[PDB]
Amino acid sequence: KGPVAKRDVLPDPIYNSKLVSRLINKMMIDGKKGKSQTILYKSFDIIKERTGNDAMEVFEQALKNIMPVLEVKARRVGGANYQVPVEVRPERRTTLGLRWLVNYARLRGEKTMEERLANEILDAANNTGAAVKKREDTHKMAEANKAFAHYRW
Amino acid sequence: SLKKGPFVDGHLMTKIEKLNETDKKQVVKTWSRRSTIFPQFIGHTIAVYDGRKHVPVFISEDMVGHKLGEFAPTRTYKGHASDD
Amino acid sequence: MAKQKIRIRLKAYDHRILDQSAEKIVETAKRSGASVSGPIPLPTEKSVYTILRAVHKYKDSREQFEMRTHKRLIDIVNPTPQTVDALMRLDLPSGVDIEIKL
Amino acid sequence: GQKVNPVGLRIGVIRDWESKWYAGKDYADFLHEDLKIREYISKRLSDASVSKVEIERAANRVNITIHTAKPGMVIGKGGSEVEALRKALNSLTGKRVHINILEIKRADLDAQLVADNIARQLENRVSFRRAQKQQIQRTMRAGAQGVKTMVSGRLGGADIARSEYYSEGTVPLHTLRADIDYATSEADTTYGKLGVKVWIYRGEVLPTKK
Amino acid sequence: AKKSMIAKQQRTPKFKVQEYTRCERCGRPHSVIRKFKLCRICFRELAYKGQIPGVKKASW
Amino acid sequence: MAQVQYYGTGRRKSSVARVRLVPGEGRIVVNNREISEHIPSAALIEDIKQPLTLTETAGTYDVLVNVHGGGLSGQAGAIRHGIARALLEADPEYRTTLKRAGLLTRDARMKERKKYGLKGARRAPQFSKR
RNA sequence: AAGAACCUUACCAGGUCUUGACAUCCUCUGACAAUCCUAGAGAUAGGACGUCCCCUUCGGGGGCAGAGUGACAGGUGGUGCAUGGUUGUCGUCAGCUCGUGUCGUGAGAUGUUGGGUUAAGUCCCGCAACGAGCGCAACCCUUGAUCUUAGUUGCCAGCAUUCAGUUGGGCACUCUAAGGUGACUGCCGGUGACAAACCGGAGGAAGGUGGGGAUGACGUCAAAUCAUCAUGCCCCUUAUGACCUGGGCUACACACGUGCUACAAUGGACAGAACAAAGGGCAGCGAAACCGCGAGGUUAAGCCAAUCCCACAAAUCUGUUCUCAGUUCGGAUCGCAGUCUGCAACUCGACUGCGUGAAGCUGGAAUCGCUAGUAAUCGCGGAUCAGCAUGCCGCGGUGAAUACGUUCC
């Protein structure tokens, strides 16, 4: 067993950073890099169109805003389940952030998928929307019930 | 089917031909159900060999292109337990 | 300057028999002859076959037996009749597909 | 499996096919004529015996060479028998024939012959255990790096069924250079048929180069 | 009834379509490849017997 | 017979490419077509062109490449490994920075042959107790 | 079940045969065999046109038919609780044993335990044990790097040619298949008894059994197959056999297993543009030209095939258009009109044109797969095959997410 090696992603040319490539990995469906590509560039364009600001900045603030500080983990030691709160790994933080992000972005119901990814990422920028609400819900399930997971396990 | 054309085995052809020209004999069995109905064949009644028992069949003007053996179902209905 | 030339071709299942046959068929070309092109490789086409293991069911288990088919070509610029008369005799091999054409 | 035949693995890498040729416009017909030749050699297997026949064909020609522990059984006196066989085969194949002969040294070492022999012993109703022991002793006289043998079906007529096997020396079937001979045989006792199997490890083959 | 079946097959069919493939070594119809006209089991046992080159088994 | 040029074969998953680093304007040529044109748009094409930019930057050498086999991304990747190895044959000294870049090897991998009893050469359609 | 329209087919119904559809011995004549007519659903019977051949001093030789005859032949009849043979299963899990010796009254134990290490009874060290056999591993194939040998039907860079690698030429390169090179913890560093081995780094196309396949140990389940074949025993024989027509193997109130297609705007529809691999082909593939909206047809070049054909890759990309709904979503069901194959498409074939436009707007309890070119998904080919492939076997395109860990199943 032991820890497994993990490949680093090929950096996205625009905007340079590999994290956007991680978005290219997560947003993708049916194995299509090109569909993720088009939705990505149209996403940067629609961000450019409404309320002018650098896309990388609002994206960075969004991803910083969508990462949970703690996460519960259910374990049936006896009658009924018992979740144990714990500090989240940063890779797990960005993973949960991007996954709840794309998931709630999928259900926005807007006619244009790019525009609702825009509305969603700006909701993350504005400390609102289903994603921030869900991270807040995880924050509620955590802390309030961390006493069982204080320093025991 | 396709073209030129519908295909009787040909014995039924001479049979119904002789029956049409004269005698006017009614009710005759056949094992060859594959044969299609023809305009010269009209008005005859044939016992159709489903296998278990021959089923007599009158020929209305309406039926021609349908297969002669199609009218008699070999299948037995239904059979089911508690109806209604 | 171009001209039609004899171009013998070989085909066989086993390869050792095939290139042994190639050496035997070019060796006659070398004596009482000239130039003598080498046996150039050809892509070779195999035929896969999947068959059930069990006499009855258990179709989930099978096996793949296959039959590859090698091919080769040999050429010579000079027809040289004497080695053509020499060509008529071929003690080896029993398993070979030689084909002569000009 | 549980036991895949070693003979189905040894061929190609370390041994040649029993019948090699090329096809061809009619791949099936050559196989038909060759299997028929096997059908008549099987009739020749009744007493004259044979370890194996090798076959080669090259368009209107055939090379059905034989190798046998007892060469004179098929030749006869004056060589008339091999000629009559040549005619009996020429009448069937429809093509020129010239059947060949070979006499194996230390013939007991061959798996086919010892298997047919112990099978005949099973036909003789000798005890199967002692017969397998005489098999191991005889193959020990033959001199080999390793030998294994096995029998199945009714044994002495006792019980509903039984299977047995004896061995001495290494018998590595999983080795790809082992050059292990394989054989099967089918005894016919009144109680029932007796399955026969034998494995012969002749030894590893060392590849050559020039 | 395999003898009756091979007797049925070796005799010329009233119509050419009727001639289904079957191996000579064994009288079993069905699941016989047309290209070699052998039984899957016929070809199996001959494969362990080794009838044709070559390799055998499970390459590529 | 003209000015000296280096060349480096580069394949991936049954897609082979033949790059030619002739010195010049540095505009790339794939099958007598521009890289901006042969695979629109496609941003990944810049990743095909990255290794030259990761090494000192920049010549830039003109590239005449002929590729065959595979899909678009695969043949483009063949263009990438092909310009990479050609850059390797440019000067021996560059290879050191290349170890930091990886960007060579062409790791041979291609889709596995299907197993019998399996659809995806690994995946099993279904299982069900009882 | 790698093709149930007939055949297959075994089973049913009806019509027929009893030394027989199939094999051999006898006596025995005679070539065998067919060409049509008649009756019949066929099966076959009643006729003519017909066979009357080949080597031998006459005995014969030869297939083959016919006749009778005892024998026999035949069974997909029963028995996988009689079997050979073949195959699942734990499981590609690392164990299962033997020789000698020791110990124990005996069964049994030691070896095979213990320490370190490994995917592994892998190696190392120690141990009253020392070895050995069957496995794992290695040996094989496939894939990747490179060299050499060999350059056409394949290859086109450097040169000219052209609509076209097509044609001169080139035989570099791609590519092709033979022989080689290469990986072995070996080089370094650290740990460890300085052992085995692990970790880190360099070298390298590929690093620590490189990736994949093959390779399935003693045995378990009286596991599966008398129905592939073979066959002990039992049973039937003018019938559990044989021939034929038609059926049925496709039933239909329903349950379950396993696939396919969708429930849609990352989309549908239209137009344009672009990248494959592998396999098959002479009783075949069948281009091109032409006819038909289509399916296909007419006609026909080339190809026994690195030449030519099956053959166009599809997703994708680029724009146009629909703007969130039982919909330009999906295609069911059915009608009409055609078409391919076949004596013949009613039961019970496939495809096309037109028309009809179910249900379904992501699915309870529950449950399955998969650690990287895997999952996801898009097309292609083949075995099968007259026709019929959503199944099976392969080929390539696009191509991820996650692995904290052994608490729990």
Written in H, E and C, the secondary structure of chain D is CCCCCCHHHHECCCECCCEECCCCCCHHHHHHHHHHHHHHHHHHCCCCCCCEEEEECCCCCCCCEEECCCCHHHHCCCCHHHHHHHHHHHHHHCCCCCCCCCCCCCHHHCHHHHHHHHHHHHHCCCCHHHHHHHHHHHHHHHCCCEEEEEEEECECCECCCCEEEEEEECCCCCCCCCCEEEEEEEEEECCEEEEEEEEEECCCCCCCCC
Strand G bases contacted by the protein (CB, 7 Å) = 1-10, 12-13, 21-22, 40-43, 73-76, 82-91, 132-146, 149-153, 156-159, 168-169, 173-180, 202-207, 210-220, 222, 224-225, 227-233, 241-248, 251-253, 257-259, 265-267, 274-281, 304-306, 313-318, 323-324, 338-347, 367-377, 383-386, 392-408
List C-alpha distances in Å: B68 to B19, B55, F18: 17, 11, 70
Q: Which tokens go with F77?
A: 């990747």
Say if the Cβ atoms of F47 and A10 lie within 8 Å: yes
Cβ density class E11-33: b for 16+ within 10 Å, e for less? eeeeeeeeeeebbbbebbbeebe
State the Cα–Cα distance between residues B38 and C5, nearest whole angstrom. Answer: 68
State the Cα–Cα distance between residues C25 and C29, nearest whole angstrom. Answer: 7
Closest CA to D55 of D69, D40, D66, D70: D66
DSSP code of residue B40: G
State the Cα–Cα distance between residues E26 and E3, nearest whole angstrom. Answer: 10
DSSP code of residue A67: -
Q: In chain D, which residues are followed by a C-to-N distance beyond 2.5 Å, i.e. a gap?
A: none
State the Cα–Cα distance between residues D113 and D139, nearest whole angstrom. Answer: 11
DSSP code of residue B35: P
DSSP letters for chain C = --------EEEESSSHHHHHHHHHHHHHHHTT-------EE-----EEEEEESSSSS-TT-EEEEEE--EEEE---S---HHHHHHHT---S-SS---B---
Q: Which of residues 15 to 44 on F have a Cβ less than 7 angstroms from any strand G atom?
A: 15-16, 18, 20, 31, 40-42
State the Cα–Cα distance between residues E16 and E2, nearest whole angstrom. Answer: 21
State the Cα–Cα distance between residues E34 and A118, nearest whole angstrom. Answer: 62
CB-based contact D115:D147 (threshold 8 Å): no
Residue E15 C-beta-side C-alpha neighbours within 13 Å: 2
Closest CA to C100 of C5, C8, C4: C8
State the Cα–Cα distance between residues A47 and A40, nearest whole angstrom. Answer: 11
Residue keyed to tokens 């070989």: C10
State the Cα–Cα distance between residues D155 and D149, nearest whole angstrom. Answer: 15
Method of determination is cryo-EM
Nearest-Cα distance to chain C for F116, in Å, is 7
Closest residue (Cα, C1') to G167: C2
Q: Which of residues 10 to 69 on C have a Cβ less than 7 angstroms from any strand G atom?
A: 11, 15, 18-19, 37-50, 52-58, 60-64
Written in H, E and C, the secondary structure of D30-60 is HHHHHHHHHHHHHHHCCCCCCCEEEEECCCC
Residue D32 is nearest to which of E24, E52, E55, comparing CB atoms? E24
DSSP letters for F41-108 = S-SHHHHHHHHHHHTTS----EEEEEEESS-HHHHHHHHHHHHHHHHHHH-GGGHHHHHHH---S---
- Asked whether residue E2 is marked as a ligand-binding residue, the answer is no
User: Is the sign of the CA dihedral E44, E47, E51, E55 positive or negative?
Assistant: positive
Neighbours of C100 (CB within 10 A): 10
Closest CA to E38 of E55, E59, E52: E52
Closest CA to D190 of D162, D150, D156: D156
State the Cα–Cα distance between residues D185 and F96, nearest whole angstrom. Answer: 67
Stated as kind and residue range, the H or E segment containing A93 is helix A90-106
Closest CA to D108 of D169, D174, D49: D49
Q: Which of residues 4 to 63 on B have a Cβ less than 7 angstroms from any strand G atom?
A: 6-7, 9, 11, 30-34, 49-52
Which residues, other chains included, contact E58 with Cβ-Cβ below 8 Å and sequence gap of 6+? C63, C64
Residue keyed to tokens 């003109």: F62
What's this structure's resolution in Å?
Answer: 3.9
Neighbours of B31 (CB within 10 A): 11
